[PDB]
Structure formats: structure tokens, C-alpha cells
Design a protein around this ligand. Structure first.
Ligand SMILES: NC(=O)c1ccc[n+]([C@@H]2O[C@H](COP(=O)([O-])OP(=O)(O)OC[C@H]3O[C@@H](n4cnc5c(N)ncnc54)[C@H](O)[C@@H]3O)[C@@H](O)[C@H]2O)c1
Ligand SMILES: NC(=O)c1ccc[n+]([C@@H]2O[C@H](COP(=O)([O-])OP(=O)(O)OC[C@H]3O[C@@H](n4cnc5c(N)ncnc54)[C@H](O)[C@@H]3O)[C@@H](O)[C@H]2O)c1
Lengths: 349, 345
């Protein structure tokens, strides 16, 4: 079993570790011990600060694969480290910067990096890429949400993944492709009711499309994030009052985060729609928290691990590769769907 | 000629001194030199710490009237000090405690204390008092606001005392009894004149709760639209909890701090077995004083004159009593008019 290093022992990172524990000798580095304590049984913990770049690259030379599960602010650097250190990487962090900026350096260094390998982006992109190949795509829609099974006031949401990254969904523009071009909207500004199966949600346009903006050529492309009602209106007022400004964000989170940390199971819901000249395609996912992990962890984490296997297998070329590429080729797409099913994540359509 | 002592050179304390400046020999005491400085041209400042009861009574002994313009936490003590000093006092501090508590002591001391002598409570009490006598009153309504003439987003208003209104229970009279309600539970839309407002129940009735024998009594405080919906959310999420409050203010104080002109408005309505009575007033900021300062400070100043004139009896008198008397009520109304404050009805 080859050596693998996962950066970050957060909820996502721990799930990736669990999934890969018997196929690789996995090492997971984090800066927080309490989190590392959680993983000693299945991975070998390392005290690592991804913050320190020259130091990080040194740790990297030992391994043949790195998987990134850091907070978003730290991701671009880790990618940089991997490339300098010449190790293949699969990254899940919700980084603000664009990984494709690093494409040349990656190609030259002959390593392959797959970024945004989570639930959405990630599996989200992969399904779209598939639709993109199978259809002469005109319009694409993604509806996605990680939600609490039993929502509760006052915020009706359960925190399952990094909150700093989460607030960003509300705080910056969301881009879409309208009339064939990229366009920006205020996410908070247009919220609508959508019903999917039994559920009634409020949906807002979000900035999850990411690489798909350049990658998927269609007239219309939008991703909508799903929420229980009552959540967004409250968030909007906070934003309006400046509570999300960087100066106060830490303080505001301290207040609100506890409200969103109550006991409930969580679920994952995704719907992907593709419209073409002759036909439409629709994919659907519903997942729930298992005994060990939240759905968000399962879906984001297992998807990354599955992708990691694909990379370790040498399937892919050098450079920085968007996750939707994986969708576009049949062998890779099918494998992903199959592995997901193995793990109880059933994607339909 | 008559020597008068004002406790606190704050906005209100300052307005009052200004009003009485020609008529009385007015001295004003504070711990804060900056405020003391603002007032030295029309009154004589003194350094007095209201915290010190024994020192307070000693200073008071030199005066024939004391006017209280302190913070609420110091108010009850000031009244006590005046009683011991045997000096009449008019108090405008928004103290938590009930002054009526000191009623026997004041009576024994042969002094007159009028309390809650401001705009609301105060003038509002006086107007309602008129109505209580004139009408067989069953329902009484008071609407009051101190607002920016020009409101800016997101708050639409221009600190702790303000939040406290959102936070604490308010008392009303329902079915002839006192009940406590959440101030934010019943937000309402009301229009007065050319004005569209949002209102919430407030805790201003106070003395009137015992004093006005009525089936329904409520005080509603007015806000420009779009302010309280935001306020409710912040409370809901815990931003108003005491541990978090300091930071919350830091975030939201600035929003409500912008250049504009304030104004004061009041509408008092009384409903009776036969007939309805109603009063209204609108005031604006001026060259020297905000509207709030003018309406509050003047009313207190006017009341002081009445007290200094030996109109009243011994003891602790709720302001509504001044309303209940025709002579007193007229004088107040008339004096207000001279100062540019017109009340109609
Ligand atoms: N594509 C998607 O669906 C999706 C979904 C969920 C999470 N994510 C992304 O996955 C990344 C992590 O996910 P999470 O929710 O597990 O994050 P988390 O915030 O739960 O934990 C982040 C982990 O990184 C560790 N860490 C922070 N700075 C570090 C440092 N200097 N050195 C070593 N460790 C450090 C933290 O200690 C923590 O253990 C985030 O970028 C998140 O945005 C993406
Ligand atoms: N009924 C109403 O409409 C109404 C309206 C406005 C104010 N008020 C009440 O009037 C009181 C003062 O009103 P303001 O708005 O002028 O107050 P403000 O807070 O502007 O100033 C209070 C003044 O009290 C002085 N002071 C504080 N502690 C002192 C101490 N230990 N010794 C000497 N002085 C001290 C301060 O130094 C300041 O000068 C407060 O109880 C307020 O609640 C009532």
C-alpha cells in the first residue's frame, strides 16, 4: 500500500481517511490535536502546518499522493506545494483563487492535480460534464443542498462543513452563464421556492459553478443552493448590517454558529438538469447521515477518495484538471458512479 | 434670585438650565468637566458626585429647588437626598424604581417632589391626565417618537438604553389589569399625519399604570419603517445578549450615526363611554437644541416653575396630576406654546 498524505483532519479529511485506510498507508496532518486524536486509529497523524510553505513541501516529498482537505484560504498554497514538491494531488478545499493559474507549472512538473473534488463542486461538475458530452447542451441547472433532517429555529440549518467558507456563499457575487456569457448576481437577491420530491426549499443562486464557467459551453448555466425557509432572510439582514465584513466575521460566527450546531441528522440532495436540442437529462441524489459520518462528509469525502484512487491509478494526464473532465469520459464517470453506489450513495438517472 | 440646583450637565440638564437662566440663579453639578464647560456661560457649574449621598445633601442645603437630570441609576438616591435636605425637587431621570415609594417621607419632610418630568413620561402623562378627567376613560393610547428627519439605511434611526427597549418587557393595561408583554411581539403600522410609522409597545406608562383607572392603556414608540424587522432578527440570534452586546453595538452604532435633523412627535388618544379626545404635537431641532432636548428639558423647566411657585402639596406627585388640574394644565400648555411648541386638541 502506497503512502498518502491528507492535509486537514477536519470532517472531510477524516472521511477520506476512513475510506482509504485499507488501500493506502495514510498519513494525515493537521495543526489541531483534538482533531488528530479522532484519527489515530485509522491513519497516522502528523503535526503539520500547511501554513508554512517551505516546510510543507518538505513533508510532501515523502509521499506519492496528497489530498487536500484544508480550509479554503489555505488551498492554493497547498496546491503550489504539491507541484513544487512534484507529487500528484486531489484537492477539495473551497479556495477562492483559480487553480488553473497553476496549470503550466503543473504540466511542466509532470504531476496531475484535480481540484474541487467534493460534492459541489466535484460530483456536481462530474455529472454536468457527462451531460455535456451526452447532449448538445443548451442549458444546465444544478440544485444542491446539505441540510438538517430536522431543521430548527432560528436559523434552520446544521453546520457540517467549514463555516467561513459557507458564509462566502452569501457574501460575494454568484456567477452564471446567461445568454452564453458569464454574468454576476447577488446571491441573496434572488431567492425562490423550489419543490423537490417531498421537500420545500428556498433556493438561491450561488457561485459553485466555478471552473464549469469556462469549461462547459452552454447558453445557460446556473447552480442553486437549497435551504430550509427562514434561513436566508435572517442572513441577509446580518449582511446588510456589516456583520460579515472581515472585521466582524469572527465575532458574528461566534454568535450564530452555536445556533446551527444542534443535534440532527443531515442529508444531501442534488438535482442536475441538462437541456439539449433533442432531449433532456436529469440526475438525482439523496443521501443521509450514516453511523459514522454526516452525509456531507460522506459525499464530499468519498468522492474525493474515489477520485484519489483514479489519480493513483495513473489514469489521468499531467496538469490541473477540473473535476468535470472526469465526467466527460465514460470509464472514469462510470467508475465514479459505481464506487459511489458501493458506498451507498445512489445517483439516479 | 431664587437659587436652583440642577443635577447633571447632560443634554437635558443643559437645556433646562438654559430655560431657567434669566429667572433663577441656577447652578449645575456634574462629575464631568467637559459638559460642565459647555454650560458655564448661562449657569454656574459645580463639581458634585451624585454617588455620594452625604455630600449631596450638604450641597443641596444651599438651594430652594433641585432639578434632577441624572442617569436613572442615580435618580432614586437623588430624591432621597432632596427629602433629607428638605428641598423641593423635580426629577426627570428615567429611574427604574418607584418614587411613590418615598411618598410618606416626602410628606413628613414637607417638600414636594414631581417625578418623570420629561416628554414621555412627562408631557405624555400630563396630556393623558387631562383626558382622564375630561372623559370617562376606558382606553388610552400614546404614540411617541424621536426620529431623524432624514432616515438613512439600513437602520433608519439615529445606545444601551435604546436596545433595552427591545430587550425588556413592557407594561400595559389590559382588561383593567397590568400585564407584561414582549415589546417586539406586536409590531404595528400606524400613520400619523403625513407620517407612516412602525410601532412597538414601550414601558413609558409607569405611574399611569396605578394612576389612570382604565380598561386599556398602552404606550407605543414609533420608528421609521425597516428598522425593527432588522431588530427582531438580531435579537433572535442572540446579538442582544449581554455577552455579545458590546461587539454588536460596535458594528451597528455607526449605521445610526449620520448627519440629520431630529424631531419629536406625539399623539395621545383617549376613548370614553361617550366621545373621544385627542392631542398631537410635532417639534423640530433648533439652533441650540435637539427636539428631544427641547421637549423634555422645557417641560421639566416649566414644571419646576410651577413647583417653585408653591402650587403643589407635599409629597411625591406623579406628573399626570398636573394634567388633571385645569390651571396646571393650561399653564403648561401655554408655556409650551411660548417656546414654540404647539400642541393641538
Ligand atoms: N466541494 C464541496 O462540496 C465541499 C464540501 C465541504 C467542504 N469542502 C472544502 O473542504 C475543505 C475542508 O473541508 P472541512 O469542512 O473538512 O474543513 P474544516 O474547517 O471542518 O476543517 C478544516 C481542517 O483543516 C485543519 N487546519 C486549518 N488550518 C490548518 C493549518 N495551518 N495547518 C494544518 N491544518 C489546518 C483545521 O485544523 C481543520 O482540522 C474546505 O476547503 C471546505 O471548503 C468542500
Ligand atoms: N422622560 C423622557 O423623555 C426622558 C428623555 C430624555 C432623558 N430622560 C432621563 O433624564 C436623565 C438625564 O437625561 P440626559 O438625556 O441629559 O442624560 P445624559 O446621560 O446626557 O447625561 C447624564 C449626565 O449625568 C451626569 N452624571 C453621571 N453620573 C454622575 C455622578 N455620579 N455625579 C454627578 N453627575 C453624574 C453625566 O456626567 C452626564 O452629564 C436620564 O435618567 C434619562 O433617562 C428622560
Amino acid at each position: 500500500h502506497m503512502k498518502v498524505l491528507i492535509l486537514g483532519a477536519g470532517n472531510i479529511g477524516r472521511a477520506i481517511a476512513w475510506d482509504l485506510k485499507d488501500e493506502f498507508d495514510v498519513y494525515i496532518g493537521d495543526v489541531n490535536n483534538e482533531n488528530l486524536e479522532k484519527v489515530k486509529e485509522f491513519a497516522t497523524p502528523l503535526k503539520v502546518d500547511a501554513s508554512n510553505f517551505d516546510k510543507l513541501v518538505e513533508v510532501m516529498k515523502e509521499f506519492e499522493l496528497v489530498i487536500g482537505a484544508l480550509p479554503g484560504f489555505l488551498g492554493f498554497k497547498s496546491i503550489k506545494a504539491a507541484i513544487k514538491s512534484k507529487v500528484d494531488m486531489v484537492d477539495v478545499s473551497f479556495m477562492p483563487e483559480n487553480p488553473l493559474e497553476l496549470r503550466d507549472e503543473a504540466e511542466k512538473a509532470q504531476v496531475t492535480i484535480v481540484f474541487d473534488a467534493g460534492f459541489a463542486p466535484g460530483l456536481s461538475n462530474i455529472l454536468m460534464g457527462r451531460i455535456f458530452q451526452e447532449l448538445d447542451l443548451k442549458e444546465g441547472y444544478i440544485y444542491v443542498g446539505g441540510l438538517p433532517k430536522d431543521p430548527k429555529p432560528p436559523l434552520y440549518y446544521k453546520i457540517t462543513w467549514s463555516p467561513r467558507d459557507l458564509i462566502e456563499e452569501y457574501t460575494r457575487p454568484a456567477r452564471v452563464i446567461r445568454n452564453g456569457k458569464v454574468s454576476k448576481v447577488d446571491p441573496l437577491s434572488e431567492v425562490k421556492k423550489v419543490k423537490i420530491g417531498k421537500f420545500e426549499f428556498e433556493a438561491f443562486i450561488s457561485d459553485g459553478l466555478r471552473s464549469m464557467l469556462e469549461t462547459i459551453n452552454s447558453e445557460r448555466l446556473e447552480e442553486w443552493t437549497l435551504r430550509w425557509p427562514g434561513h436566508l432572510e435572517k442572513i441577509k439582514v446580518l449582511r446588510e448590517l456589516g456583520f460579515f465584513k472581515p472585521e466582524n466575521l469572527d465575532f458574528t460566527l461566534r454568535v450564530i454558529e452555536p445556533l446551527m450546531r444542534y443535534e440532527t441528522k443531515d442529508f444531501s440532495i442534488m438535482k442536475v438538469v441538462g437541456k439539449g436540442e433533442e432531449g433532456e437529462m436529469e440526475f438525482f441524489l439523496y443521501d443521509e447521515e450514516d453511523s459514522m459520518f454526516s452525509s456531507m462528509s460522506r459525499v464530499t469525502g468519498f468522492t474525493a477518495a474515489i477520485i484519489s484512487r483514479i489519480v493513483a491509478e495513473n489514469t489521468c494526464t499531467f496538469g490541473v484538471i477540473p473535476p468535470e473532465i472526469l465526467g466527460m469520459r465514460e470509464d472514469t464517470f462510470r467508475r465514479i458512479i459505481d464506487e459511489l453506489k458501493e458506498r451507498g450513495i445512489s445517483i439516479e438517472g
